[PDB]
Amino acid sequence: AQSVPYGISQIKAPALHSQGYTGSNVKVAVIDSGIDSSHPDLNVRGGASFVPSETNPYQDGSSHGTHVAGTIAALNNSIGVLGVAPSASLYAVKVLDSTGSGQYSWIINGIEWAISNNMDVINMSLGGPSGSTALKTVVDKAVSSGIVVAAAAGNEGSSGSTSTVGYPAKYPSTIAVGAVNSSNQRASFSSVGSELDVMAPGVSIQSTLPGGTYGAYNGTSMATPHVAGAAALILSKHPTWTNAQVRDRLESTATYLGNSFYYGKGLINVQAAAQ
Numbered sequence: 001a002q003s004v005p006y007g008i009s010q011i012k013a014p015a016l017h018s019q020g021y022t023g024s025n026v027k028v029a030v031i032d033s034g035i036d037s038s039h040p041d042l043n044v045r046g047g048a049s050f051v052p053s054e055t056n057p058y059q060d061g062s063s064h065g066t067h068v069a070g071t072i073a074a075l076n077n078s079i080g081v082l083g084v085a086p087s088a089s090l091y092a093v094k095v096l097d098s099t100g101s102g103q104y105s106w107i108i109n110g111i112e113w114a115i116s117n118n119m120d121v122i123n124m125s126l127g128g129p130s131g132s133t134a135l136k137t138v139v140d141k142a143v144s145s146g147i148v149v150a151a152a153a154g155n156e157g158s159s160g161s162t163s164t165v166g167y168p169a170k171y172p173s174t175i176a177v178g179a180v181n182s183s184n185q186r187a188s189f190s191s192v193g194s195e196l197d198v199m200a201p202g203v204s205i206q207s208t209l210p211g212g213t214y215g216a217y218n219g220t221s222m223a224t225p226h227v228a229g230a231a232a233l234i235l236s237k238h239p240t241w242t243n244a245q246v247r248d249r250l251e252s253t254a255t256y257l258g259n260s261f262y263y264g265k266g267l268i269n270v271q272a273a274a275q
Contacts, residue, residue: 004082006182007071007201011226012271013084016233017076021274023085023232028072029119030225031110032065032126033100034058035092036210041080042069046117047092050109054097060210061098067217068125070208071225072232080214081206084229084270085236091119096126104131108138115141120235121148123228124168125221129156131167143173148231148243152220153178154191158262163193170195175247178264179203179223184255186262190220196264198254200226230270237274249273 008014016022027045034051037044037058049057060066073083073090095110096102107126114122115138122142142149151174154166169176169191176195179187179202187203202223204216227250234246241249253272254265 002077002079002082005206007205007226008082008084010182010201011084011230011268013229013233015271016237016274021233021237022076023088023229023236025089026085026121026232026235027089027091027119028121028123028228028232029091029093029114030065030069030072031093031095031114031122031124032068033062033096033098034060034065034094035069035090036060036066037092039066039208039210040212041074041208043075043090044092045089048113049094050106051094051097051102054094057092057094062096062100063209064100064125064221065096066210067207068123068221068225071205071222072123072229074208081208084226085232088229088232104135108134111138111142114147115145119147121150121228121231123225124149124151125224127152127154127166127169129166135168136171139168139171140173143243146243148246149173150175150177150224150228150231152224153196155189155219156191157189158192163195164191165193165195166191175227175250177220177224177227179220180257180267184257184267187218192262194261197251198227198264199223199257199267227268230268230273233270234274
C-alpha cells in the first residue's frame with residue numbers, strides 16, 4: 001500500500017488534494033544530484049545534466065536528489081509514499097555528482113536551464129557558507145523571470161546571534177527554508193538568521209530512494225521540497241499568481257512557531273496559503 005509521510009499532512013497538503021489540486025502542469029526543477037527516473041513512484045518528465053562526469057540526469061548515484069524529488073511529487077497510487085504535489089511535472093537538473101557535491105559553475109548552468117525551459121518552481125536542496133557573484137546573478141535572474149526558488153537554509157545550527165544561513169538561501173530573492181520535526185520543534189542542526197523565512201518538516205522524512213525503495217533522511221534538504229511542492233499546489237489552484245504572490249502567501253499564512261530568528265514565519269500551511 002501507499003503511506004503518507006507525516007510531513008505531507010503536517011503542511012496540510014491533503015486538504016488541497018481533496019479540493020482537486022495536486023500540482024498539475026506545474027514545472028518543478030529539482031536542482032540536485034539527479035533523479036532515478038526508473039523509480040516506480042516517480043514520474044520524471046525531462047531534465048539535463050550539467051555534471052561533466054555524469055552525463056545522465058535520470059540517474060542518481062547519491063540518493064539525495066531522488067529523496068528530495070519524492071517529497072515534491074511521489075505519485076498518488078497504490079505503492080510507496082505521496083508527494084506534496086503528486087501531479088507536478090518533475091525535471092531532473094543534475095548539478096551535483098554522486099558524492100552530493102558540485103561546482104558553482106554546474107549549479108549556475110542548471111538554473112540557466114531552468115529559466116530557458118520555463119520551469120515554475122526551482123528546488124535547491126543545497127548550499128554553502130559563501131556564494132559567488134555569478135550565483136547571485138543567475139538566482140536573481142530566475143526570480144525576476146517569474147520562478148519560485150526554494151533553497152535549503154543550511155544545517156549549520158546556531159552560533160549566538162550570528163546568521164548561519166547558507167547561500168543561495170541567504171540571498172533576498174530565494175525562500176530560505178528551515179527544518180522542524182513532527183512536534184514543530186526546530187531541528188537542532190537547522191541554520192538560523194534573519195534571512196530564514198519559513199519552516200517545514202525536516203526530521204525523519206520518508207521518501208523515495210534509488211532502486212525503487214524508500215527511506216528516511218534528516219536535513220533542511222528535506223524541508224525545502226515541502227515548500228517547493230507547496231508552491232506547485234498553490235500555482236495549480238492559482239495559475240496567474242506570480243512568484244512574489246506565492247512566496248508572500250506561503251510566508252504570511254505560515255503557523256507562527258516562535259522567535260523568527262529560529263523559525264522565520266513558522267510552519268508553512270498550504271491550505272491557508274492557497275485560500
